[PDB]
Enzyme design. Structure first.
Site, PDB file in Angstrom:
ATOM      1  N   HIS A 220       9.181  -1.155   2.526  1.00 37.28           N
ATOM      2  CA  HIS A 220      10.077  -2.240   2.134  1.00 37.28           C
ATOM      3  C   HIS A 220      10.885  -2.808   3.296  1.00 37.28           C
ATOM      4  CE1 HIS A 220       9.165  -0.583  -1.828  1.00 37.28           C
ATOM      5  NE2 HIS A 220       9.722   0.565  -1.481  1.00 37.28           N
TER       6      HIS A 220
ATOM      7  N   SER B  92       5.691  -4.658   4.625  1.00 38.72           N
ATOM      8  CA  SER B  92       6.366  -4.117   3.454  1.00 38.72           C
ATOM      9  C   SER B  92       5.352  -3.427   2.550  1.00 38.72           C
ATOM     10  CB  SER B  92       7.091  -5.222   2.678  1.00 38.72           C
ATOM     11  OG  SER B  92       7.779  -4.673   1.569  1.00 38.72           O
TER      12      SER B  92
ATOM     13  N   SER C 147       9.878  -6.655  -2.325  1.00 38.17           N
ATOM     14  CA  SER C 147      10.993  -5.845  -1.848  1.00 38.17           C
ATOM     15  C   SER C 147      11.558  -6.296  -0.506  1.00 38.17           C
ATOM     16  CB  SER C 147      10.569  -4.374  -1.744  1.00 38.17           C
ATOM     17  OG  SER C 147       9.586  -4.211  -0.753  1.00 38.17           O
TER      18      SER C 147
ATOM     19  N   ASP D 278       5.103   4.533   2.863  1.00 38.08           N
ATOM     20  CA  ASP D 278       5.924   4.704   1.660  1.00 38.08           C
ATOM     21  C   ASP D 278       5.017   4.319   0.496  1.00 38.08           C
ATOM     22  OD1 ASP D 278       7.622   4.506  -0.574  1.00 38.08           O
ATOM     23  OD2 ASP D 278       9.241   3.531   0.536  1.00 38.08           O
TER      24      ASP D 278
ATOM     25  N   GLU E 268       7.161   8.615   2.781  1.00 41.48           N
ATOM     26  CA  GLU E 268       8.541   8.471   2.321  1.00 41.48           C
ATOM     27  C   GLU E 268       8.755   8.949   0.884  1.00 41.48           C
ATOM     28  OE1 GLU E 268      11.205   7.311   4.008  1.00 41.48           O
ATOM     29  OE2 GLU E 268      12.658   6.727   2.451  1.00 41.48           O
TER      30      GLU E 268
ATOM     31  N   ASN F 223       9.913  12.931   1.710  1.00 48.05           N
ATOM     32  CA  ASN F 223      10.560  12.828   0.402  1.00 48.05           C
ATOM     33  C   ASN F 223      11.336  14.090   0.054  1.00 48.05           C
ATOM     34  OD1 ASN F 223      10.794  11.330  -2.321  1.00 48.05           O
ATOM     35  ND2 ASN F 223       9.940  13.298  -2.965  1.00 48.05           N
TER      36      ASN F 223
ATOM     37  N   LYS G 134      16.975  13.592   1.346  1.00 46.73           N
ATOM     38  CA  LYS G 134      16.176  12.463   0.888  1.00 46.73           C
ATOM     39  C   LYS G 134      16.060  12.514  -0.631  1.00 46.73           C
ATOM     40  CE  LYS G 134      13.043   9.295   0.120  1.00 46.73           C
ATOM     41  NZ  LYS G 134      12.291   9.145  -1.169  1.00 46.73           N
TER      42      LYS G 134
ATOM     43  N   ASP H  15      18.622   9.782  -1.892  1.00 47.69           N
ATOM     44  CA  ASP H  15      17.827   8.575  -2.113  1.00 47.69           C
ATOM     45  C   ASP H  15      17.336   8.441  -3.559  1.00 47.69           C
ATOM     46  OD1 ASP H  15      15.266   7.016  -2.313  1.00 47.69           O
ATOM     47  OD2 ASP H  15      15.423   6.845  -0.117  1.00 47.69           O
ATOM     48  N   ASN H  16      16.427   9.330  -3.978  1.00 51.96           N
ATOM     49  CA  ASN H  16      15.757   9.150  -5.269  1.00 51.96           C
ATOM     50  C   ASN H  16      16.739   9.135  -6.435  1.00 51.96           C
ATOM     51  OD1 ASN H  16      13.938   9.812  -3.252  1.00 51.96           O
ATOM     52  ND2 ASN H  16      12.501  10.802  -4.668  1.00 51.96           N
TER      53      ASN H  16
ATOM     54  N   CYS I 173      19.090   5.230  -6.991  1.00 55.37           N
ATOM     55  CA  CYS I 173      18.830   4.506  -8.231  1.00 55.37           C
ATOM     56  C   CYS I 173      20.098   4.374  -9.075  1.00 55.37           C
ATOM     57  CB  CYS I 173      17.707   5.190  -9.012  1.00 55.37           C
ATOM     58  SG  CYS I 173      16.109   5.186  -8.122  1.00 55.37           S
TER      59      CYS I 173
ATOM     60  N   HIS J 221       7.204   3.647  -8.454  1.00 57.03           N
ATOM     61  CA  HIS J 221       6.665   2.987  -7.269  1.00 57.03           C
ATOM     62  C   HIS J 221       5.679   1.873  -7.624  1.00 57.03           C
ATOM     63  CE1 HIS J 221       4.184   2.580  -3.526  1.00 57.03           C
ATOM     64  NE2 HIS J 221       5.405   2.515  -3.026  1.00 57.03           N
TER      65      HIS J 221
ATOM     66  N   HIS K 181      18.361   0.525  -2.374  1.00 59.82           N
ATOM     67  CA  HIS K 181      19.434   1.473  -2.102  1.00 59.82           C
ATOM     68  C   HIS K 181      20.385   0.937  -1.027  1.00 59.82           C
ATOM     69  CE1 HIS K 181      17.039   3.868  -4.602  1.00 59.82           C
ATOM     70  NE2 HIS K 181      16.640   4.821  -3.775  1.00 59.82           N
TER      71      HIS K 181
ATOM     72  N   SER L  65      17.625   9.196   4.205  1.00 61.37           N
ATOM     73  CA  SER L  65      16.166   9.060   4.188  1.00 61.37           C
ATOM     74  C   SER L  65      15.627   8.786   5.586  1.00 61.37           C
ATOM     75  CB  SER L  65      15.745   7.936   3.235  1.00 61.37           C
ATOM     76  OG  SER L  65      16.160   8.172   1.893  1.00 61.37           O
TER      77      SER L  65
ATOM     78  N   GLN M 199      13.095  10.345   8.600  1.00 63.76           N
ATOM     79  CA  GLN M 199      11.897   9.699   9.134  1.00 63.76           C
ATOM     80  C   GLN M 199      11.855   9.768  10.659  1.00 63.76           C
ATOM     81  OE1 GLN M 199       9.110   8.706   8.095  1.00 63.76           O
ATOM     82  NE2 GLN M 199       9.207   8.037   5.950  1.00 63.76           N
TER      83      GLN M 199
HETATM   84  N1  LIG Z   1      12.640   2.542  -6.853  1.00 61.32           N
HETATM   85  C1  LIG Z   1      13.092   3.423  -5.974  1.00 61.32           C
HETATM   86  O1  LIG Z   1      13.962   3.138  -5.146  1.00 61.32           O
HETATM   87  C2  LIG Z   1      12.412   4.766  -5.900  1.00 61.32           C
HETATM   88  C3  LIG Z   1      12.973   5.789  -5.142  1.00 61.32           C
HETATM   89  C4  LIG Z   1      12.353   7.023  -5.077  1.00 61.32           C
HETATM   90  C5  LIG Z   1      11.181   7.227  -5.763  1.00 61.32           C
HETATM   91  N2  LIG Z   1      10.658   6.232  -6.506  1.00 61.32           N
HETATM   92  C6  LIG Z   1       9.414   6.450  -7.291  1.00 61.32           C
HETATM   93  O2  LIG Z   1       9.770   6.726  -8.622  1.00 61.32           O
HETATM   94  C7  LIG Z   1       8.808   7.635  -9.203  1.00 61.32           C
HETATM   95  C8  LIG Z   1       9.500   8.888  -9.666  1.00 61.32           C
HETATM   96  O3  LIG Z   1       9.869   9.663  -8.504  1.00 61.32           O
HETATM   97  P1  LIG Z   1      10.692  11.010  -8.708  1.00 61.32           P
HETATM   98  O4  LIG Z   1      11.106  11.481  -7.368  1.00 61.32           O
HETATM   99  O5  LIG Z   1      11.718  10.818  -9.763  1.00 61.32           O
HETATM  100  O6  LIG Z   1       9.554  11.967  -9.284  1.00 61.32           O
HETATM  101  P2  LIG Z   1       9.745  13.221 -10.239  1.00 61.32           P
HETATM  102  O7  LIG Z   1       8.474  14.060 -10.229  1.00 61.32           O
HETATM  103  O8  LIG Z   1      10.905  14.005  -9.756  1.00 61.32           O
HETATM  104  O9  LIG Z   1      10.035  12.625 -11.731  1.00 61.32           O
HETATM  105  C9  LIG Z   1       9.072  11.945 -12.573  1.00 61.32           C
HETATM  106  C10 LIG Z   1       9.263  12.485 -13.969  1.00 61.32           C
HETATM  107  O10 LIG Z   1       8.504  11.719 -14.932  1.00 61.32           O
HETATM  108  C11 LIG Z   1       8.135  12.598 -15.971  1.00 61.32           C
HETATM  109  N3  LIG Z   1       7.042  12.007 -16.742  1.00 61.32           N
HETATM  110  C12 LIG Z   1       5.726  11.902 -16.371  1.00 61.32           C
HETATM  111  N4  LIG Z   1       4.956  11.351 -17.278  1.00 61.32           N
HETATM  112  C13 LIG Z   1       5.826  11.072 -18.321  1.00 61.32           C
HETATM  113  C14 LIG Z   1       5.638  10.466 -19.581  1.00 61.32           C
HETATM  114  N5  LIG Z   1       4.448  10.065 -20.044  1.00 61.32           N
HETATM  115  N6  LIG Z   1       6.724  10.296 -20.368  1.00 61.32           N
HETATM  116  C15 LIG Z   1       7.912  10.724 -19.925  1.00 61.32           C
HETATM  117  N7  LIG Z   1       8.210  11.324 -18.766  1.00 61.32           N
HETATM  118  C16 LIG Z   1       7.119  11.466 -18.004  1.00 61.32           C
HETATM  119  C17 LIG Z   1       7.794  13.908 -15.269  1.00 61.32           C
HETATM  120  O11 LIG Z   1       7.882  15.038 -16.130  1.00 61.32           O
HETATM  121  C18 LIG Z   1       8.853  13.953 -14.151  1.00 61.32           C
HETATM  122  O12 LIG Z   1       9.985  14.764 -14.454  1.00 61.32           O
HETATM  123  C19 LIG Z   1       7.746   7.845  -8.121  1.00 61.32           C
HETATM  124  O13 LIG Z   1       6.749   6.842  -8.289  1.00 61.32           O
HETATM  125  C20 LIG Z   1       8.552   7.625  -6.840  1.00 61.32           C
HETATM  126  O14 LIG Z   1       7.748   7.312  -5.703  1.00 61.32           O
HETATM  127  C21 LIG Z   1      11.245   5.025  -6.593  1.00 61.32           C
HETATM  128  N1  LIG Z   2      16.991  -0.533   0.743  1.00 64.19           N
HETATM  129  C1  LIG Z   2      15.821   0.121   0.908  1.00 64.19           C
HETATM  130  N2  LIG Z   2      15.143  -0.036   2.070  1.00 64.19           N
HETATM  131  C2  LIG Z   2      13.989   0.621   2.239  1.00 64.19           C
HETATM  132  N3  LIG Z   2      13.367   1.454   1.409  1.00 64.19           N
HETATM  133  C3  LIG Z   2      14.050   1.598   0.271  1.00 64.19           C
HETATM  134  N4  LIG Z   2      13.708   2.374  -0.816  1.00 64.19           N
HETATM  135  C4  LIG Z   2      14.710   2.187  -1.732  1.00 64.19           C
HETATM  136  N5  LIG Z   2      15.656   1.358  -1.332  1.00 64.19           N
HETATM  137  C5  LIG Z   2      15.251   0.979  -0.064  1.00 64.19           C
HETATM  138  K   LIG Z   3      20.412  -2.520   0.263  1.00 67.83           K
END
Ligand SMILES: NC(=O)c1ccc[n+]([C@@H]2O[C@H](COP(=O)([O-])OP(=O)(O)OC[C@H]3O[C@@H](n4cnc5c(N)ncnc54)[C@H](O)[C@@H]3O)[C@@H](O)[C@H]2O)c1
Ligand SMILES: Nc1ncnc2[nH]cnc12
Ligand SMILES: [K+]
Ligand SMILES: NC(=O)c1ccc[n+]([C@@H]2O[C@H](COP(=O)([O-])OP(=O)(O)OC[C@H]3O[C@@H](n4cnc5c(N)ncnc54)[C@H](O)[C@@H]3O)[C@@H](O)[C@H]2O)c1
Ligand SMILES: NC(=O)c1ccc[n+]([C@@H]2O[C@H](COP(=O)([O-])OP(=O)(O)OC[C@H]3O[C@@H](n4cnc5c(N)ncnc54)[C@H](O)[C@@H]3O)[C@@H](O)[C@H]2O)c1
Ligand SMILES: NC(=O)c1ccc[n+]([C@@H]2O[C@H](COP(=O)([O-])OP(=O)(O)OC[C@H]3O[C@@H](n4cnc5c(N)ncnc54)[C@H](O)[C@@H]3O)[C@@H](O)[C@H]2O)c1
Ligand SMILES: Nc1ncnc2[nH]cnc12
Ligand SMILES: [K+]
Ligand SMILES: [K+]
Ligand SMILES: [K+]
Lengths: 462, 461, 461, 462
Positions: free
Chosen positions: D54, D77, D82, D132, D157, D182, D187, D191-192, D196, D316, D375, D383, D387
């Protein structure tokens, strides 16, 4: 030396009570400041006060402040379960007439109030009244009307009691003026709300030791008591739902993040089993009544509650819950004092391992005082500082000494002035170590107040 | 060939209309009034001057007034609060509006004047809707003759009410007014919960700063201060609160905030020596919420921690001594309504200087300036009250009454509690909430009608 | 004619049993194990020495072990943690129990010995369940020959796991152990949410102090410190947090807490000059959560604000320098497990002195000392792990192995994730929660079985 | 001037991006600490890094830290929505090859990654990869396998990306070693989760400006992203329900105060409309997917959701939601970029005042980055310091230059040592003004650690 004008559970608890009173004084800076400010002037010299309010450690500090300012008192509790026996003992050991213990019967409750009204078998020459809920006020008007001829006023602590005073006023049957202590902001929006926040989950833990997190609660009412009660449970992690008849209070509940539901389908209570939302109530682990109203947890609701749900009331009177129905139909198993399992399997006996029961706390009486110690000292500080100021004001007015025609213009239900409300609040803030900012002269002029206050118009709701 | 308007960009009208249609579904109290009163046309003949933030929410209010029969001429009450797509859509509907985001002060006055004047002469207005009292003031000071034909004023906000009451106390208020602010479905909804939603919203859009774990100081703890403190605490800020009102300070304590003063012992003597420099040196974010003057003063600004954010969510920007900052420090625009203020001096700045503050919206209302203000479902309650207040005063016809009868009705009043409850009821149904109905025995027990009102007028909620 | 016990008051048994029947309805995972394993009697022939807080919750654990075929002999692992009605109900059921609330140190040791000895000779024990490692230590040190017949140890809490690992490091651990603490349905349930429930509970029972608006210092931010901080924050306290672990301190910051040290620059050189006196002088409540030694030391106690409350919720009382206070300051008992400590000296005190501190449970585990510890529905998770741990080790029969085989089998391990998940599912069902089932396609998409385990062993939750 | 090796939306946005980069540098002390500590030694001199992540302001600071330590990079990206166009412009203006803009098509997304891989129409001499989600990693293995012969490692990532790496390793198809960034605690559990928490309600407000208080939300998943997402809504006053397939995560949701539900009756997803809990979904105002799984908000759920519900995904990839079904059957009305009304009345045409629609954000892509800015800098500081450390480690290891038998010993997926995890956290804590206490030697010996750390065993879960 031979003091016998009292009745408590166990006088040997006095030392323990005195240790806790000494601690409470350090938690009550508004009340103790009044004690230091007014001791030399003795503003209550000549006051003879009939008092009826929960005989807690906090009431003790109130009682000894009134006495320190010159008053003589005679005291009872306003609930059969709310007394702290070590507090009663310490007050008696100080030579102050008190008639109160935890676990009174209704008959004993009435006897205690009458022992404050009668000294050596005859009406005490009282001239002031301090009341919480209106029971003493009611007995004086109904049974001892002549005693009110010499009484200068009533200071009334709680919402339900204020309501009973206002009914008497509208009907022309109130005999003396009163101060509504409840509606000071340092009372209603401190005691009524934050007090129940502290003490509602307190009492439930001591009675049951139930985990509350992740469980389902229904709170009936969202007034000041319903607000603090809802917060008490949500902050523990409960999933809280709220019922209300007042749409403005229900709007607040929505904005505070609660779901607003009715125990009745479409909120229509037609008295039949069919109007109960059985699916909703069959999910509820805990119901709390906070309304000051009658039959808001009714018999059909009790029949529909989830097995093993907890039922309690934190409004003033136990008729918020149809406990009468439960006495007449279901079998009561005492777990411990003020904790009962109520077996919905029938009236004659119960299976010790039956799963279909409800847990009732304090037999439906005020649950924070019945199963714990009610509000904490630093919160009651605000309430009881208003009480002391209201007693001084009405005693100083001397209503009873006016002619018939001068009483007529003075017979009202009033609140204390905002300036004093603010002065109570300032001491409470200082008690936390807070530092209030002072307006500059140009800032005071800009918003149109005096540098020393009051800072809000009487219409302000906070 | 309608041209009686001025906005940033008329081509945004379709976008604005799409968001108005959504907002209507978020505003059931206001839309319920629109449907309820369309047949009667209670505002037919009303000619309303309106001065309030030209948002999407204000747009729904405007069209409701029109649907009930009114003609209007509209401006915003702040130079940064307009949503240009809201303005465009109102203009495209043939409704006179003069508003855009980013007005100058001169342009702001012209906009109000353009609603007061039509074709060079005073419009035959007979009603006023105001937020902050700027239009009310211009009418009394520059166009007094027009108040001879105006039936009343409905005023939105705390500061505006204060200005009304000062006029009334001084004998200078020329027409009656309804205090829309002090409906419970306004003050304890809009002022508190609206700022809870929109304060942290605006800080994120302006700076994208993390808030959790940082130190904030909120000046004031009335309705706006309570909501602003919650906006920050719920994000995980460590929040301290300042107050001059000991009762509000008491609420802050019981709500779990430490109460502090920028001044040693709370005493402001105008010198640097009275500033609590150790306290302010630790503050990452300061928010003013008072409606008062100079509550974040120059000595406080000199003492703030490097890189702290400064913003105001009260109605007027003089809560912060920005004038001092304009005179002594160098301003670097980060992007519209976001400025770095470099405390190193006046004549230029180092692009990598670390000794700056970040000011949002040049000290103007930050929720409206850096975001979109309160959300539709909250403004629903405020604007339903506005409509009911316009109906009540227009029907009273104050301007037509004989002098003795005018004197009886020249006051500042609030709406009846019954109406406050009916607004709240539609709000609750919008969330899917179900209100319980008292039984006759229960209503008799507490002494109310089954239909309400349910509380005495003294109740504070 | 059963006499093989000692408790405070046998007549409390009926009350004890009533609370056990309620507890059973709060502990579905545990009771589920009763039903699943009762028919097979997997603990038949097991003779378990148990040392853990003799609460109502421990009573349900005991009767589950017995229902599955085990004999037991039990003591508490703390002098104040017993609920006398729970020990009475266990005794009345015919089970050897030696435990009461308010033991002396001598009595504490005597009680453990009464489980080890039956009729003056060592019991023929073959299993151990421990909480803190005191029973494990006595066996290794004073009764080594008994460990030749023991198949393993299941240890409840972090401090005890540390002592097992020290022995494994040194080669002095004689039997294998299960680390019950590090099951997720234990550590991230009991240690965290358990203290969240029961810390503010115990403080309220002891002092009835208002917590909202006051200042707290929590030493440590592991699982216990996380839950303790939340116990106080949710009540409205302003909570500051101390840590030696920068990762845990990072989490406290993100959770909305200010991270501080009792010492200047965080350097604990043992002098008064090192104490941050301004900080300690503001603190109304200090709670230790570390499992470490002297983290609330003498200079900190001397600097604390007057009338501060002092308490420990770690396993052992040496987190707080109470020996200093015993040697220098006069103790005034308010009621059992509540003492005022008068900093005016050792030779008596003034009943109205204002310079005192309030110590809870004499520095012992405060949630168990001044209240009832964790609630049943939380201890359900912990104790279902204990039961499965006991079966796991007992069914492996380490003690029957030759020495060469024991050496390969000796270890300290956690239960497999699959059992962890099974416990968790029963806990979720007790709340009425509904877990969703993966489709075959979804299971393949994320590389797990429809039946779990759902996470790799590295996952931290 | 002269430099043309990039493609961004609008180069004139560079000055604005530079200003936000300077601000973000003050929000990222761990990352700027690495920049200052290692600038002199130039540990990345000779590195040629392909980067796919991103293109935000925070990524800009990461990119310029890698360059400041000696690297050359070519960047794209990892998501079509993003990029922050002002960040992309600032990087290109600094002479750094970048191919990224907000609102790419799927074809342009592929083109952009290809432009990093190829310089002047032939493979660049890359020797490091920062990814990532694994898209770039997958293209190298499948379409450019010869380039991996020169590459020393991959630093990945995010959770989904790591999953894809572990399956390649299990199958023997991963050609170079990787560092799982990750699963550093600074991280994953920063981050995660907390990222969020900050950015989910942020994005929903920017997209819709909907009030969240008082409304009903369904969060699918309760891993790190689901935990932070649930808190993001609950803290706003939403009534939040949680779905999970993992009973341990479900147990945490209950204890955290959430009701755990399933979209399917008894949780059984059999693909039929009859299996949907229509009463439950007909009450939901907002559904958020957080799982990294496929089709967890499926067609039959979409058909049953309350009218005017908001639908978004913060995992993701967009296949968490069945947007394909919605494209095939319903009419999309664009409210504004990344905000669409989906009219369930049909595929062709719609009534402009239709009431039966859903609001989909970011077309189902990562909503926090799609509708806001992801974030905040001070969270991404953790994070991205990981890296940089991970890049330095694998570049110094020189995997592509080792003998074959050494390659086989080092071909794995690893995490950074806990000591570095702690060092990153320390700089984060100092960024807040936190003060970490130093153990005494006695205290260190008592708990069995060095005064310098590490302070926990590798089994510790925090
Ligand atoms: N948008 C963001 O900024 C951001 C940041 C970090 C990670 N992510 C992404 O978000 C996703 C989740 O990452 P995470 O670190 O939370 O993983 P995680 O493994 O910690 O959590 C995912 C959860 O989903 C549950 N799950 C799976 N299938 C399901 C279903 N059918 N119904 C209900 N629950 C279900 C699992 O049991 C698990 O606990 C990944 O794709 C990750 O790459 C996004
Ligand atoms: N601001 C950000 N920059 C890069 N990667 C990210 N993943 C989640 N938020 C982000
Ligand atoms: K930001
Ligand atoms: N236990 C305590 O420590 C304590 C302290 C203060 C007051 N009280 C008592 O608690 C009660 C409530 O006091 P308050 O100050 O909160 O009063 P209040 O008027 O502020 O609130 C009571 C609420 O109950 C609601 N209500 C009435 N009937 C209802 C029904 N059938 N269903 C649902 N909601 C209904 C009303 O609309 C009102 O909002 C009174 O009896 C008061 O004396 C107890
Ligand atoms: N931005 C918005 O969306 C929005 C919405 C409603 C109102 N407002 C405005 O916000 C302001 C506050 O309105 P309100 O309804 O909260 O009024 P209010 O009277 O309830 O609150 C203002 C508070 O500021 C306190 N205060 C005054 N001077 C102070 C000082 N020097 N230091 C500390 N505290 C001080 C007062 O004691 C008072 O409690 C007004 O200007 C109002 O018009 C803004
Ligand atoms: N009372 C209860 O109900 C209960 C429940 C479970 C565990 N415990 C006990 O509580 C203690 C802590 O258990 P845990 O699971 O949280 O362990 P933990 O390892 O997760 O946490 C202890 C924390 O204290 C920190 N710490 C150590 N020395 C410190 C110092 N000098 N200053 C500040 N912080 C310091 C460490 O960094 C660590 O993070 C143990 O003794 C455990 O047995 C008690
Ligand atoms: N502790 C207390 N003492 C007296 N009255 C009370 N009402 C509620 N709590 C009380
Ligand atoms: K109390
Ligand atoms: K808005
Ligand atoms: K317990």
């Amino acid at each position: 030396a031979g003091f016998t004008d009292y009745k408590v559970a166990d006088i040997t608890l006095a030392a323990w009570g005195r240790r806790e009173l000494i601690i409470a004084e350090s938690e009550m800076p508004a009340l103790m400041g009044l004690r230091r400010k007014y001791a030399g002037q003795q503003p209550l010299k000549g006051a003879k006060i009939l008092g009826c309010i929960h005989m807690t450690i906090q009431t003790g500090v109130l009682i000894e402040t009134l006495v320190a300012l010159g008053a003589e008192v005679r005291w009872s509790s306003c609930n059969i379960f709310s007394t702290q026996d070590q507090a009663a003992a310490a007050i008696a050991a100080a030579g102050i007439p008190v008639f109160a213990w935890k676990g009174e019967t209704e008959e004993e409750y009435e006897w205690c109030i009458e022992q404050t009204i009668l000294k050596d078998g005859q009406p005490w020459d009282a001239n002031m009244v301090l009341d919480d809920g209106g029971d003493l006020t009611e007995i004086l008007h109904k049974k001892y009307p002549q005693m009110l001829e010499r009484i200068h006023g009533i200071t009334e602590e709680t919402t339900t009691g204020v309501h009973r005073l206002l009914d008497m006023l509208k009907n022309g049957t109130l005999k003396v003026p009163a101060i509504n202590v409840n509606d000071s902001v340092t009372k209603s929006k401190n005691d009524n709300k934050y007090g129940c926040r502290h003490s509602l989950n307190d009492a439930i833990k001591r009675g049951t030791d139930h985990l509350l997190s992740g469980k389902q609660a229904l709170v009936i009412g969202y007034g000041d008591v319903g607000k603090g009660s809802s917060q008490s449970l949500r902050q523990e992690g409960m999933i809280v739902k709220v019922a209300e008849v007042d749409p403005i209070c229900a709007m607040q509940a929505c904005m505070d993040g609660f779901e607003v539901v009715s125990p009745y389908k479409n909120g229509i209570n037609d008295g039949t089993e069919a109007s109960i939302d059985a699916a909703l109530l069959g999910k509820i682990d805990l119901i709390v009544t906070t309304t000051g109203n009658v039959n808001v947890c009714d018999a059909n609701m009790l029949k529909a509650l989830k097995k093993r749900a907890v039922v309690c009331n934190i409004g003033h009177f136990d008729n918020e819950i149809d406990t009468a129905f439960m006495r007449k139909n279901w079998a009561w198993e005492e777990v411990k004092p003020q904790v009962h399992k109520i077996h919905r399997t029938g009236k004659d006996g119960f299976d010790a391992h039956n799963d279909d029961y409800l847990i009732l706390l304090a037999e439906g009486r005020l649950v924070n005082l019945g199963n714990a110690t009610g509000h904490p000292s630093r919160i009651m500080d605000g309430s009881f500082a208003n009480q002391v100021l209201a007693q001084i004001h009405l005693f100083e007015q001397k209503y009873a000494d006016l002619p018939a025609a001068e009483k007529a213009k003075r017979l009202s239900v009033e609140v204390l002035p905002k300036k004093l409300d603010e002065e109570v609040a300032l001491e409470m803030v200082k008690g936390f170590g807070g530092v209030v900012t002072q307006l500059t002269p140009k800032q005071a002029e800009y918003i149109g107040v005096s540098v020393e206050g009051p800072f809000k118009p009487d219409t302000y709701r906070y």
